[PDB]
Amino acid sequence: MDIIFVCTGNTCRSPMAEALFKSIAEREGLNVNVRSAGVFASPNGKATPHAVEALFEKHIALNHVSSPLTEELMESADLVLAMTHQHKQIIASQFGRYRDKVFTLKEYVTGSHGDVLDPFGGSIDIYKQTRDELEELLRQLAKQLKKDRR
């Protein structure tokens, strides 16, 4: 199992979800890899001064530098977890409808298309609201994985 969290510019939430899921997987004794990318990210984007601070408040000390989602990473991974249906369709448009590997961030857990709070460019409080929702989701995501590590 290798998971790619994906949002347009990566930094918006994907590395928060990565850091949380690593921490939660370590709590649960799950065995995975998780990474993050963006359909229009670049190899020199990084964790925002509020995402990183929100996970420092979580006492995880996030540190991440972005990269684009490209087909070799897609082929290497076993799950893709996209923040929106629009992102899912961009991924499909990049990779010739490799869409089967992709699920939306709520969808993989709720069973229905949707997203968490998008904090991109908000104050620390918005990333704080996000990481609470994101943790609650990712605990259910760990519950979903423990079925088959998928």
Swiss-Prot record:
Q: CDD domains in the record, alphabetically?
A: LMWPAP (cd16344)
The reaction(s) annotated as catalysed by this protein in its Swiss-Prot or TrEMBL entry are: N(omega)-phospho-L-arginyl-[protein] + H2O = L-arginyl-[protein] + phosphate
Activity regulation reads: Efficiently inhibited by Cu(2+) ion, Zn(2+) ion, sodium pyrophosphate and N-ethylmaleimide, while the addition of Mg(2+), Ca(2+) or Fe(3+) ions has minimal effect. Inhibited in a competitive manner by vanadate.
Result of mutating residue 7 to S? Complete loss of phosphatase activity
What induces this protein's gene, according to its Swiss-Prot or TrEMBL record? Expression is up-regulated in the exponential phase of growth, followed by a significant and gradual reduction in the stationary/sporulation phase. Is not up-regulated during ethanol stress.
Which residues make up the binding site for substrate? 8-13
**Marked site: Important for substrate discrimination:** 11
Catalytic site residues?
A: 7, 13, 118
Q: Does the keyword Hydrolase apply?
A: yes
With respect to pH, the record says:
Optimum pH is 5.5 with pNPP as substrate.
- Molecular function via GO: protein arginine phosphatase activity; protein tyrosine phosphatase activity
Query: For this protein, what is the EC number?
Result: 3.9.1.2
- Record's SMART domains? LMWPc
Q: Which Pfam families match?
A: LMWPc
Q: Which InterPro entries does the UniProt record give?
A: LMW_PTPase, Ptyr_pPase, Ptyr_pPase_sf, Tyr_phospatase_low_mol_wt
- Sorted UniProt keywords: Hydrolase, Protein phosphatase
Effect of inactivating the gene: Cellular protein arginine phosphorylation is only detectable in a ywlE mutant and not in the wild-type strain, and global gene expression is significantly impacted in the mutant strain. Cells lacking this gene are impaired in dephosphorylating McsB-P. They also show a reduced resistance to ethanol stress.
- Family as reported in the entry's similarity comment: Belongs to the low molecular weight phosphotyrosine protein phosphatase family.
Q: What does this protein do?
A: Catalyzes the specific dephosphorylation of phosphoarginine residues in a large number of proteins. Counteracts the protein arginine kinase McsB in vivo. Can dephosphorylate CtsR-P; thus, can restore the DNA-binding ability of the CtsR repressor by reversing the McsB-mediated phosphorylation. Is the only active pArg phosphatase present in B.subtilis. Exhibits almost no activity against pSer, pThr, or pTyr peptides. Appears to play a role in B.subtilis stress resistance.
Q: What is this protein called?
A: Protein-arginine-phosphatase
Give the species this sequence originates from: Bacillus subtilis (strain 168)
- Name the gene behind this protein: ywlE
